[model samples]
Structures are given as structure tokens and as C-alpha cells.
Target: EPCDYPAQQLDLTDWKVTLPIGSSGKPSEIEQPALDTFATAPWFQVNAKCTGVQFRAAVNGVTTSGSGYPRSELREMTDGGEEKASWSATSGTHTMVFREAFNHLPEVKPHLVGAQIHDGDDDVTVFRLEGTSLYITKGDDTHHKLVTSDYKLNTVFEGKFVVSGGKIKVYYNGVLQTTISHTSSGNYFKAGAYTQANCSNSSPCSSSNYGQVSLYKLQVTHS
Candidate 1:
């Protein structure tokens, strides 16, 4: 059986994250410093076996820094090493947003539903994320641009996720990023630089892409 948590106001005031190489638990190489300087704020974990989940945390927010650290040195899998799976958004002055789904993983059995990345060409009211430009890593080792906003400095993106009937739809900053079919009842979720490039300054991620997130309320229901 899956584990569950109580419905109390989560104590996330002490959730500290060190970025630069990997997202969490995973650290970058053993020869670089300042490389692990990115951090995720207001974080907490709930080991629940839920079908669906949502929340609207009314607290603070943070942004993504240049090149999130990588936990381990780049390795090869059944499909070689992925290079484009790691990327960054153009950015704005709003807030950095991220929704990392490990459901593609095992244990939970949740569907992927729908996902999209809006770079510049998109709606303006909701996503209001930075750049309108997005860095995407899909079914292969490649990175592409979605929407191309205006600025290219330090900014944040607004967004949300909706899943129903095994369909996951995502809207980056409100530009209707895109929606595709997916299936996953994942078990792990986090923000920051956990899944990254070859942990280097070459390939696709050499410059820097920061991520900032501010939560108001994350409400979801599942059986």
C-alpha cells in the first residue's frame, strides 16, 4: 500500500535546496564550487499514493539560477546520454515556475496526460512567464524553442497543470504552451536542477537559465 500524510499546514520554512549540478539528493562533480549554488524554496514532501493532486500554497517564491548543478557526471543509458532534457526559459520579473513529473517513473501508475512549452507565440493573461521562449527536452536528445517573448534577462514564468482522463495539459505563463496525451501516476516531484545535462558547460546548456517559483495555493483531488 502507498503512504499518506495528514492535512496540516505543511512546515516548509526549512526546505532548503542546493542547485548547480543535480536537482536534489544528487550533487554535481567533486571538483567544482559555486556550481552547486541554485536552490529551491518552500518545499515539503508528502508520500501519498494519490490518483490526483493539487495545491495553492500562499507563501513565497524564488527564481532559477544559471546552470542548475548536476548530481552525477553524464552517463549513458539504453539510449545514450540525453543532452536536451535540460534547459531554461528566457525569464521575466514575475516568478520562475517548474513542474517536474517523475511519474514517467514507476510505483504510482499515473498517466502523462498533456504537456506543452510556450516560448514566445502564446496567450498573455495566464502564462505571463518570461521570454515566451522555452527550452524543451522531448522523446529524444534535442532541445527546441517554443514561444519567443521579448526580454532575455532574469525573469519568471507563470503556469499551471491540469490532468483528467489520462490527459495532461500544460500552459507556460498562460500562452497555451501545448497539450498532448500521456499516462503516469508518478511518485516523485521536486523543483530545481535535479535532471540536467552532461553536467557541463557545453553541448546545449552552456550559458545559464534560472528558475524562480512562487506558490499561492495548489489544490487537487484524487481517489
Candidate 2:
């Protein structure tokens, strides 16, 4: 969706790639994630599947994530051991998922990973699953949920969560994450997970020692 510039330059896409909702610009995929932050007004969106259920980024700015909390959010930054895991967020609760190892689902597994700035919270923005209460009309945030649920473990894995409609699926770190149905069409999205506005170290606060999560090889499909 680039604008028709002076000459429809050939290197336009390289200079800037659009950020949909729920997606991140993985350094492994985009390289300079910081560009994403500067390009937009800190308010954008992208849609994607959770091929690995992990949100990757550069270690240069503040980031937020669901990382499948209630089990293992990100870890305490070893940079100085300030504690990055303590910043819990209020991700809604309709149905979520998290179990250490990978599971198995056959077809409904996610096909993309989501990244966005959950700025409405503090400490560190969370992937709040606001049940039916989730709406992004303005630049505000709230709770949101799961049925066929959801992170970013400290390893490289393949698997994705396809979110269509209001339902989202969590794939196996190496297997799958749920066994439910109900996804959205045109669910394809992208965004960045950040916590620069409302900084806090509490349930809705962005804590210190938060490290960067790098996403790799981002792709989308229309089926």
C-alpha cells in the first residue's frame, strides 16, 4: 500500500514495509525494527499467523508481549537482572493456552505471528485477551481471549496461530497449542509490542530488564 511516489521507485518496498495490526517487524525478517517505530505515529496494526507463536524484534527499544504468560512471560533480563518477568499484563480471559512443550493440532495451526504495542498497560504491555471488550477504534487499549489458545520460548520453533474473526489458535512450539475452532477471515495482521507510553513495573506496568524478542521469516497466505 505504498503511495505512488515521484517515479514508483523500484526500491520503495525495501525502504518501508507497512505494519498491519498484531504483527512485529522481526529483525530476522526486517532487520531494522527500529524503523517501524519511527515510520508510524506509534499507532498502527498488522495481521499475521503465529507460525512460531513468538514475537521477535531488535534490542534497541521498549517492547511488550503476551509471551504466553500465566505460565512463562519473558524472563528477567540478564543484562543486570532487573526482572522483566514480573511485569504481568491484563490480557483478557475467554480462553488462553500455555504448557511448556509443544502439542499437536493438524490444520488449524497458526500461519503467522502477531506483534503490537500494547501501550495501554504499564510495566510492560501485555497481549491482553479482552473478551468481546477488545476494540481498537481509537488509540486506546483494553482486555481481549482464547478458546483455541497461545508465546516466545527461548528457542527457535516452527508453528503459527491463524486468527480469523475473533478466535485465535496457538500452534505447537514444535507441535500446536489448542484444539478449538472459530477464526477470522482477512485475519492477516501485523504490529509491534512496545511499552514506552505507560511505563510501570506493576501488573499493568513496563518493568526493567526487558530484552528484545526477534521474529524471523514473516509471511502471509490467503486461503
Candidate 3:
């Protein structure tokens, strides 16, 4: 069997970007912060896992002003297309590295990376990788948690998602993590840091509160 469509070097170019934009004149105010700011030029590069080109999200820390929170970051976004074929992945391999990870403050819940399916308003997160564990959401939007491995800071995790006819399978580090009856299809893949915590103007949020993750490898193929 051969895949009719394979991953292009710029498969992510056409993808959309969604960052945290809370209000005007606030520390979180970011108007069209260039994707180039988050994405490395040449798209990919070599890392610890292997040698080759890879897409990485290396975001530097931003200092904060008095009574203002540090810049909260975001990168997980969806493609513009609405077709199932455009967003869905019959098969794919994605690898990620938490280039910088830190223990969140008592008030913050840090998000490392994740992906969502469906371009519609009802889009639901297909999978999410947090600092503590990996989570998968079902049709009903009920999340199923797998506590198999504890992904600490600076760890590498690989995910393989495949959809063939009726059965669906997902792999972690080449190990079969789960096989389930999944009906949902992906419209896009969201990588990098997406913060889940919000802070007030009066509160103290430092650059150390930022979420950082690097996407070293990504491949999408279909029959």
C-alpha cells in the first residue's frame, strides 16, 4: 500500500495561528505576532532525538512591568479548511520535545501541547499532552486519561495516529498505548505552548510562567 498524499515541507504554512489576546494595553496584547517568531526558519533542524530538519517553537521569556502579568503564550491552532479530507489524517507521525518545562505556580495550570479536530464551531480537542500526562477526548467530549508515563521536563514523546476503516490506533514512543473505536478526524495539528492558566493585572506573573515546547518531527500521509 502507498500513500497518495504525503507531508510537504510547508504543510504547516497554510495552518492558522491562535495566540492569547486578552485585552488592549495589557501585557498579553499581541497583534499578529509573526509565526516566524515561534517557528524556526528553514522549518526544521537537528535535535537530540535524531539528525534532520524539524519544526521548533523556541520562545524566549518576556519581562513584565509593574502590576502587569508576564506574557502568556499560545500556538495550538487549526487549518482553515473545512473538508474532512483536508483536516483528517489517515496516518501520521508527530514527535515533540519540551525544550523548557517548569513547575507551575499554585495558581497556574500549564499546557505543553495538543491538537484538535474539526474546523466547525463545535471542534473538540482530539488529544492533549500536559506536563503530567496525556489525555484523549471521546465523542461526548469526555476525556480519557492514561497515566502510563510521567512526562517530566525536557522529555521526548512521539505520537502515531492512524485511522483505517473502522479501527483507530495511537502509539507513544513506538509502544502501543491504546486502540479504540474512534470516529473523529483531525482538521489540524496544534503544537507548541498553549497556556491554560490566566492571571489578573494585580497578580504577579513572571517570564518563568511561560509554556515552551519544540516540535522536532511531523509527518502526515494517507492512502
Q: TM-score of every model?
A: 0.35, 0.30, 0.52
- Cα lDDT tens digits, model 2, 147-195, are 1332323333333444334444445344434433332121122322322
After the best TM-score superposition of candidate 1, give how far the Cα of residue 144 lies from its true spot, in angstroms. 6.4
Q: CA lDDT, every prediction? A: 0.27, 0.25, 0.38
Sort by lDDT, best first. 3, 1, 2
- Candidate 1 lDDT over 1-223, as tens digits, reads 1113211222122122232333343432221121123222212223233321121111111213433323211111111111112111221111223432222101111111112322233211122222223433233312323444352423344455444454444555666555544333321112322222222422333223222222322222222
Better of 1 and 3 by lDDT: 3
User: Superposing all C-alpha atoms, what RMSD in Å does each candidate have to the true structure?
Assistant: 16.0, 16.4, 9.0
**Candidate 3's residue-wise lDDT over 92-165, tens digit each?**
43222222222232124544334333333443334454546666555444345463446665555666655555
Backbone clash numbers for all candidates listed: 65, 63, 4
lDDT measured at residue 193 in model 2 versus the true structure, 0 to 100: 30
